[PDB]
């Protein structure tokens, strides 16, 4: 049965369950709905009593899958999310669920074209040049993507800015230039 | 004369680099101008 593979790949149990769910949901065209239900089911899982009951190793998997089944029925989930939770409980990978969840999340994070990119600076930089760099960086993008900026601040670079656009990486910091031309004066 | 010239010019090159570390919105603006000049 041919799969619908996501744009980005996650590996491990997280990646396997997330790819299985992504390819499932893309066949019925329900990706956004399944995504919302995964957010909700993860927030449900983080409940203290439920987390204590699903992480418990001496609880029989029959009563555990029954607990997960009925607590899934108390929210009226999609058949895809219900079957995913049932598969995770039946296989004993409930502890990994949030990982799986976030995996799918990050998968859809690229489906919406949201390109992550962090700008590390020396001192916290104000918003004028922030919108300036927003505009100049959205030129770095292909058809229809939107920036996810995280303006970080470490003064150890003592100037300039290090820009990580997805997997591209430019080093406009001053420490790298100082060390580079210092090496050049030494070599 | 060479070895004294080598130790000295070595003690100079790490001085002058260490002495500007002790030393700019124009640069932050110039960086975005350079990122625009990337194309």
């Amino acid at each position: 049965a041919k799969l619908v593979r996501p744009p980005v790949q996650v590996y491990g149990i997280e990646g396997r369950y997330a790819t299985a769910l992504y390819s499932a949901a893309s066949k019925q065209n329900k990706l956004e709905q399944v995504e919302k239900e995964l957010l909700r089911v993860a927030q449900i899982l983080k409940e203290p009593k439920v987390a204590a009951s699903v992480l418990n190793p001496y609880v029989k998997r029959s009563i555990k899958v029954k607990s997960l089944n009925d607590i899934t029925a108390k929210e009226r989930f999609s058949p895809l999310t219900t079957n995913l939770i049932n598969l995770l409980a039946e296989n004993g990978r409930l502890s990994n669920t949030q990982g799986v969840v976030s995996a799918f999340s990050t998968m859809m994070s690229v489906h919406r074209g949201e390109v992550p990119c962090t700008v590390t600076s020396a001192s916290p930089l104000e918003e004028a040049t922030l919108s300036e760099l927003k505009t100049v960086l959205k030129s770095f993008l292909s058809q229809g993507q939107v920036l996810k900026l995280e303006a970080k601040t470490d003064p150890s670079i003592l100037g300039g800015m290090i820009v990580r656009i997805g997997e591209k990486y430019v080093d406009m910091s001053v420490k790298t230039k100082i060390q580079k031309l210092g090496r050049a004066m030494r070599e | 004369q060479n070895m004294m010239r080598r130790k000295e010019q070595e003690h100079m090159i790490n001085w002058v680099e260490k002495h500007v570390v002790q030393s700019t919105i124009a640069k932050c603006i110039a960086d975005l101008k350079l990122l625009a000049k990337k194309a």
Binding site: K177 | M12, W15, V16, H19, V20
Partner: peptide, 15 residues
Amino acid sequence: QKLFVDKIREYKSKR
């Protein structure tokens, strides 16, 4: 021109 500041202002400093 951070290093170019360095290169002149420091060789001047050594001079």
